[PDB]
Amino acid sequence: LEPHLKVTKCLRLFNKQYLLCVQAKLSRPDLKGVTEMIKAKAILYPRKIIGDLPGIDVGHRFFSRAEMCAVGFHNHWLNGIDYMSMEYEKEYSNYKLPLAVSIVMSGQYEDDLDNADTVTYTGQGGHNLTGNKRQIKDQLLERGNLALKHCCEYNVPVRVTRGHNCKSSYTKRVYTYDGLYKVEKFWAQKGVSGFTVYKYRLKRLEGQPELTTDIEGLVCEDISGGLEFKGIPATNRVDDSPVSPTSGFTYIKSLIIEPNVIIPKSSTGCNCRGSCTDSKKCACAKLNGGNFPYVDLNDGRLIESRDVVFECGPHCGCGPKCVNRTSQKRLRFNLEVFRSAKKGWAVRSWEYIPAGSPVCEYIGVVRRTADVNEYIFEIDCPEFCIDAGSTGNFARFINHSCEPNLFVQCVLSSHQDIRLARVVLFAADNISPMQELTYDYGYALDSVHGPDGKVKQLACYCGALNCRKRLY
DNA sequence: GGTACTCATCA
DNA sequence: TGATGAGTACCAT
Ligand SMILES: Nc1ncnc2c1ncn2[C@@H]1O[C@H](CSCC[C@H](N)C(=O)O)[C@@H](O)[C@H]1O
Ligand SMILES: [Zn+2]
Ligand SMILES: [Zn+2]
Ligand SMILES: [Zn+2]
Ligand SMILES: [Zn+2]
């Protein structure tokens, strides 16, 4: 129902198509992903819209031009100016068409001038796509240039999105929707390359979140023992307790099996050598239904959720680099444990996390549920659970949300007993720096009874729009 | 139907 | 570094 959720699910569907095209090794799988979205009538906003799109807030970060196409936010994958064609002329009979609704500024036009709240934006045309990429002939008042002129004359604002470079390993560039701007005036003049260009002076409208630019409270330098490949610092700027999240608690990197929990028969595994790449020859690809569930992109991303993923294991002939061991690899991201206002400790990332990336296995002591307060994860892909109450990895610090950005994935690798699957958290969405990582704990309402005559209730503080207000 | 256009993306 | 990329937008040589 709710538009932010619609946007989320559209973007997840695009990400699925994208990764499937990457697996098929198709040219420009981003664009192919869009074509698949069009075929499936899955473009969220299939017609042009003036102003804001519901579910797309000012500040929204897009991870490719293609994503913007998938949502319907900006319909060309290349073109800087998106406008209503003459098809829209009866719908908007009092405006003069064409009429622009969205522009992208990515530093490609030498005449562009970016001063944040004020922008001088170059029209389209005569722009070289090959070479030093300069203007190579005069522009005229046509196409997008006309569209922008009409915006100026009819007081129709345009959405403005900026491309930004990232020094991250996995995402090279991001596009931020920076809000509505009015087209104040336009004119022709000689550009820096000596040919005529049209220029559009844009001024950011008020009534919007401010444009923004861009270790305090450290309580522990690395909550792992140096056991994670990337250290995980902890902070507390909520109060000044000097207490670390590690007090009382022993960080571990591998599961601990309680003595009365059975150790199932080891998986037979595959006979591939080095890395598994041929899905015909690989028994582990066969277990998954014939294809690998992970794609070899950004050190391994899960294409889509499954009842269970079958990874290579102890007896496979392949080494640790195998893409079908994706969730077994080193922590890829710089993370931080921080004190939340009302949920206790919480986890966020300092880096971008691509959708489908593994975040972590839930590590703790595996116990029979019959033998077992707030750090237990039942394995239900329930006879067995993972207890991180006294020992575990960082997973136990991740909070619940009614609108999460991580999801739970069961993985079999050491053995084939589904009751004892590994529990692994993957990014459901593309996650930006400093966003809290969360998953849905999945408790039923009124499942919990206090030791007396009361249903026991626990308030949710996830802050989501559709919060429902109770963990249970 | 025919096609000129184009502010990305790939190590 | 540049070759490709595909959904138009508009005319229908
Ligand atoms: N969305 C949410 N709202 C309120 N409390 C939450 C919450 N998500 C997690 N919690 C709290 O965190 C517990 C899960 S363990 C998660 C780590 C915990 N926040 C800590 O400080 O160690 C829950 O029992 C609950 O007390
Ligand atoms: Zn393998
Ligand atoms: Zn194999
Ligand atoms: Zn294998
Ligand atoms: Zn909630």
Q: Compute, in degrees rounded to 10, the torsion defined by CA atoms A42, A44, A47, A53.
A: -170
| Relative orientation angle of helices A29-39 and A3-23, to the nearest 10 degrees | 120
- In chain A, DSSP finds a helix count (H) and a strand count (E) of 5, 26
Instruction: Please give the Cα distance from A472 to A449 (Å, whole number).
Output: 10
Which residue do the tokens 């902890």 mark?
A: A234
- Name the domain boundary from A179, A214, A249: A214
| Spatial strand order in the sheet of A256-257 | A256-257, A365-368, A384-387, A376-378
Q: Count CB atoms within 10 A of the CB of residue A251.
A: 20
Q: Give ∠ CA A373-A378-A381 in degrees, rounded to 5.
A: 170
**DSSP secondary structure code for residue A446 in this structure:** T
Peptide bond into A98 cis (omega under 30): yes
- Name the domain boundary from A77, A112, A142: A77
User: At A270, which CATH number?
Assistant: 2.170.270.10
The finding on whether A375 has its CB within 6 A of some atom of ligand 1 is yes
Q: Count CB atoms within 10 A of the CB of residue A32.
A: 18
In the beta sheet, which residues pair with residue A368?
A384
A337: helix, coil or strand?
strand
How was this structure determined? It was done by X-ray
Closest C-alpha to A85, from A77, A73, A75, A140 = A75
Instruction: Please give the Cα distance from A304 to A290 (Å, whole number).
Output: 15
With beta carbons less than 8 A apart as the criterion, state whether A154 and A148 touch: no
Closest C-alpha to A295, from A353, A357, A360, A351 = A357
What value does the CA radius of gyration of chain A take, rounded to a whole number of Å? 26
Structural domain of A44: 1-77
Q: Residues by CB within 7 Å of nucleic chain B, which ones?
A: A 28, 30, 64-66, 76-81, 104-109, 112, 121-127, 129, 143-144, 163, 172-173
In the beta sheet, which residues pair with residue A335?
A349
Are both A164 and A252 inside the same structural domain? Answer: no
Q: What are phi and psi of A36, to 5 degrees?
A: -65, -45
Write the Ramachandran bin of A469: left for phi over 0, alpha for psi from -120 to 50, otherwise beta. left
Tell which atom from ligand 1 comes closest to the C-alpha of A375. Answer: 15
Are both A302 and A222 inside the same structural domain? Answer: yes
What's the resolution in A?
2.0
Query: Could you give the number of structural domains in chain A?
Result: 3
**β-strand A345-349 against A335-339: which pairing, if any?**
antiparallel
Are both A208 and A348 inside the same structural domain? Answer: no
Are both A454 and A321 inside the same structural domain? Answer: yes
Are both A197 and A247 inside the same structural domain? Answer: no
In the beta sheet, which residues pair with residue A398?
none
Q: And the tokens for A83? A: 């406008």
Using CA atoms, how far residue A227 sits from A48, A250, A326, in Å, is 51, 11, 18
Closest protein CA for atom 6 of ligand 1: A343
Closest C-alpha to A122, from A212, A205, A197 = A197
Q: And the tokens for A27? A: 């040219």
Which residue do the tokens 């950011």 mark?
A: A204
Closest C-alpha to A354, from A399, A303, A320 = A303
Closest C-alpha to A313, from A408, A419, A409, A415 = A415
Instruction: Please give the Cα distance from A230 to A222 (Å, whole number).
Output: 9
Are both A314 and A427 inside the same structural domain? Answer: yes
Q: Which ligand is nearest to the CA of A461?
A: 1
Q: How far is the CA of A127 from the C1' of B6 (A)?
A: 9
Instruction: Please give the Cα distance from A73 to A47 (Å, whole number).
Output: 9
